[PDB]
Amino acid sequence: LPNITILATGGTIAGGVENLVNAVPQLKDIANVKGEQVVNIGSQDMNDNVWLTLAKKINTDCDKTDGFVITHGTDTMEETAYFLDLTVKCDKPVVMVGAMRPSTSMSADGPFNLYNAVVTAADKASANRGVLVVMNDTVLDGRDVTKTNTTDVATFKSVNYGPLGYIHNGKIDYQRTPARKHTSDTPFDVSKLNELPKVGIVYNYANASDLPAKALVDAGYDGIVSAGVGNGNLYKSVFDTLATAAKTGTAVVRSSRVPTGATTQDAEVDDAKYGFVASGTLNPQKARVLLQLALTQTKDPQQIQQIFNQY
Amino acid sequence: LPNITILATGGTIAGGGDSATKSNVGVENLVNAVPQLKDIANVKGEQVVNIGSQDMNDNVWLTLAKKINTDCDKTDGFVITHGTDTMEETAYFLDLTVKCDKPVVMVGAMRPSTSMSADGPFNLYNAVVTAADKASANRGVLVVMNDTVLDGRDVTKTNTTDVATFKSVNYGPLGYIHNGKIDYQRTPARKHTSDTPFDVSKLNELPKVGIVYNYANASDLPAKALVDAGYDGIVSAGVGNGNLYKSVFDTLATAAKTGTAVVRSSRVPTGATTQDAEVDDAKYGFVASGTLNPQKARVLLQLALTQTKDPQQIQQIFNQY
Amino acid sequence: LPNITILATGGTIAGGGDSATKSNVGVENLVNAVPQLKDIANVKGEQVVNIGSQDMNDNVWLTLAKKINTDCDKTDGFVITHGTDTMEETAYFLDLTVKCDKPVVMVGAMRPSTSMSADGPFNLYNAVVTAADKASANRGVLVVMNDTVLDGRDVTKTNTTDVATFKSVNYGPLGYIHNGKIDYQRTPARKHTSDTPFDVSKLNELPKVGIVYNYANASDLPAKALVDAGYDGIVSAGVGNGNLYKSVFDTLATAAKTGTAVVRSSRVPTGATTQDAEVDDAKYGFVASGTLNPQKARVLLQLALTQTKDPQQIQQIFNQY
Amino acid sequence: LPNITILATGGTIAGGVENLVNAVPQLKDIANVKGEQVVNIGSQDMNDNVWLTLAKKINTDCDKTDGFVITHGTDTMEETAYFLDLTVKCDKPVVMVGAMRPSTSMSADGPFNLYNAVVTAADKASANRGVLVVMNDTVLDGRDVTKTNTTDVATFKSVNYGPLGYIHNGKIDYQRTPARKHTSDTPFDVSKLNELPKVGIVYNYANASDLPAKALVDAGYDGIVSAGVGNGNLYKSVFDTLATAAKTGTAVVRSSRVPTGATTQDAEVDDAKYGFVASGTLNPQKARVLLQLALTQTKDPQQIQQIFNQY
């Protein structure tokens, strides 16, 4: 059976980490499982330092195991998954998993989610598909996956392009793979980084204040992601503040608060005139992930736009 | 035929039929752009304001509510043409502040009126059908898009470009439109229009309420900037079931005990931010938004703050409207 | 605490808590498999029948309706445990024939009770919560699955394996359940339970109604076989908005003028099969099903045929229930 | 500009076929369009003879054009699309398109759907993705696409695995391609066939009659697809009739009336014992398509099951 490493970032999702094989004994029939506690935080407190720790650990320990499962809180799992999708260089499956119900609650979803995550990490067909999220019997790619509902066990969906495969009786039928470049096909190399460029997110809505945007600019933030209205549009005072900042060198990415679809180039904002970048199907928190990593390579809006077109 | 007033807030959502007859109009041309409006209503148009909906603001909201409430006895129903980007916010504001019980229907277009297969003309026709239907009364303010009647509280823009973008993502639509007929199977249970206490006829401004986003390694600077500006309320677009990044939590905990109303909503597009989850709202003086997303929670918080600053009373408001 | 009766129609959807105490139950063990039922209700269980729901039939339907109507005054609410494959059919049959106004809630499980992360226990808990809630009365027969309360008319199985499969795909759910509390925001407008004329207490059989599928190059032999057997009604699972393959159309046109009731439904999983579309129903004597899918249209057609054979009166029934 | 052939099977969807460039003049700016009327029927009357005509025409005329657009009624478009997905051997885009509103109705969707279908057929990136359906600004694969709503212009969706790309301003961002084998990677060759094996569909529901199933068996049908309940289950009397028929050599495929998900092997029916085949994510009408073509190659249930696992 394959050697699978479980990297935990918080509390247990079934039934500490070295006792998962006794909480889910059926794991022993599909893998030899070894567990390590990397951090212990709630995922609402996820941060850049944990991201760097996780990427470096996977890239360092790749040769010591056949696949990785990362147990993670659901709140920010979609952000961590995409960060690792862009920075992991390991050739072996990396699978993120969580639980929408507490492990001690009735009909807890964690045990079977963990089982199916280990199935996915052990499947030779899972390799070269990027970093994966496995939730509710489904294999999802780290780029498009997002939390769609605040409480449903079925909350995680790839809302623009769909799942990669479904799991039944411990077997996966993969019918899709992400076309955007991931893992060893990206230039992002965080092995020597102690920190990431500073990128914040501002919301747009009727009568929106420019004060949040101005505060990030005044703090010297390297980039700002706009959660715009509709197809990435901005309330006038927010636009004005971000347009001035882009002329001073702040990177500005237009995303959307709208939960599906793409913030497109060639719409109602002349991005080239203002020095802005359109996020495509990346939602604001995912756009932040790629913008931070883009800013490790370049500050030029045309080159950042090309990054947002390839990854 | 019913008298229907169209209130325009921006550009035309339907064009055509405007060839001149003299050798030598705007909203008044809609009866020529969509000539079959004649079959279903007596239409009169007024241009209230002309702005893109990404620049929607409190002043336009107050103008619309006051106009509808003042002109209720002069017409049988209202249609408001509005940009799609913030329609869901205006719809809910009017849902809470309109006291006319005659139908008020909002409508827009996801394709330009000059484009191939423009959706505006048929959307406008169906909006007038809805405003003319006696069965549409007493259901609150409505949004009519893509052959569907949606209630103003739950309706939201779900896709950046699709003509089918507007959905009531938690509780579903009220009715579907086919061949100019509506089969209504639902009505909102939350209190609306004349069953709310919100009365803005005499108000010239609304309490200041801003929105902050949560994500990994979120800065507290947006929240701090609102607090420094003396904002009356702050809505948090939380992660998951309304949770907060530690730095943002710290600032909002301070703000809630120092005279700021704090509502926990969620960046997650469906589902409720609940009480009795993983944030002790009673300890911190916070309010949970329920199924109201951040921009909709801002609407209700602004209006709540015209009545009260007490967090327990604001929570009751968020449990009733 | 309310008295809640559980009527089981098959295997247990929750297990455990059954260790013996003597050195030397089935549905009666559910209070041990889900011990927190004690916190919310006084539960008594009866095994009505024991079958897989793919073998559901008219006799079980009649038994359930009669039992609920007979035992209504002996309890405060009912929960029916049922297989998922045909739950949506039984739910609608009971929605039309139950005359008790106390809550009747159906519940099932998409994972075996012995499996990892089995959904049955929490589904049953939430079903009892719903049946015990005074607010659940007068909303018709309900289905409670995956923390959601769904009305029996619109609820359908949308996925072959997902625990979240049951959805009200046209008009949405009535309420969501969190921490043992329901926030109801909707109720069905179509007439149900004591507002219908359908009374099956004295009936030992139901009219014969079959379903035929439409597709490219569809054979007329299924339809002809029903007609030859003297079926009282035939439901067509049409293509698109209720359309029929030419050979099937020919047979059903003949059947409708020769004493068979013919209802046009659709294999398409959401939306209505409408009147005034591309099938002249008046000319052919057909009835359009609206949002009722084929198996749900069969339920209403069977019951319509206990009252009338007249296609105009059956159409009115399909417009009211 | 590319040469695009429009093959019409019914009435016009914009504004006969030789006049589409004047109904949608913007087509002239993206392609040189030539139109042919192959048949003129409503798609509710679609049939095997039209399917054979279309496949042979595309395979014969492949060298004479750069891509194909087929105008088709929406009712059975998902069946024709999958038939062609399995039988077209041409290396050039084949794109199906229709309209949910009449061409003479307000806000008719046909004109822009046709424009976007020609965009897709002209895009070099559309090749080698199988037969496509283009509806409501979206490119969908012929296998998974299905009509989800009776009237909505947005009705067509790939409900299990998602779309291949979205179209904005005449440009497509493809992020997916079907993994199941299609077009020139299948063995199905209809170039010399005058007819297809007889395959019918029976519905399952409470108290279901076995008489439809028995009628198809008595007519000597080569195959029967069951629209089962849940995960492909059958009402007892239908099961019994189909089990007896399978022992006599009738091919029997279990599908489901449930609109998403897979009728799986290793569930509540012992397919190997009874000689049945599980359809996977193919719905009943799509399962019929593949079963008919399977039966041109083999009558053995294990070999038919392998076909349903590869195509």
Author numbering:
A (entry chain B), D (entry chain B): 1 to 15, 31 to 326
B (entry chain A), C (entry chain A): 1 to 24, 30 to 326
The authors write:
Here, we report for the first time the structure of E. coli type II asparaginase in its ligand-free, open conformation (APO-EcAII) at 1.6 Å resolution with clear electron density for at least one protomer active site flexible loop, comprising key residues involved in the enzyme catalysis. The asymmetric unit (ASU) comprised 4 monomers named A, B, C, and D; chains A and B and chains C and D are associated into separated intimate dimers, each representing the functional unit of l-asparaginases. The electron density (e.d.) of residues 16–30 in chain B and of residues 16–31 in chain D was unavailable, which was consistent with most of the available structures for l-asparaginase present in the PDB. However, a clear trace of e.d. was visible for the whole loop in chain C, though with a slightly lower quality for residues G16 and G17, and for most of it in chain A (missing residues: 25–29). Compared to the closed form, the active site flexible loop has been captured in different, open orientations in two chains of the new crystal structure. In chain C, it is partially bent towards the α1 helix and its residues S23 and G28 form contacts with residues A38 and N34, respectively. In chain A, the loop is even more open, and residue T21 forms a 74.5° angle with the position of the same residue of the l-Asp-bound monomer. Apart from the active site flexible loop, all the other structural elements and the catalytically relevant residues of the APO-EcAII are superposable to the corresponding elements in the EcAII-ASP structure. The oxyanion hole described for all the l-asparaginase structures solved in complex with both L-Asp and l-Glu products, which is partially built by residues contributed by the loop in its closed position, is not evident in the new APO-EcAII structure here described. Analysis of solvent in the APO-EcAII active site pocket reveals the presence of five highly coordinated water molecules (for reference: 408, 412, 446, 529, 592 in 6YZI chain C) that interact with residues involved in l-Asp binding and are present in all 4 protomers of the ASU.
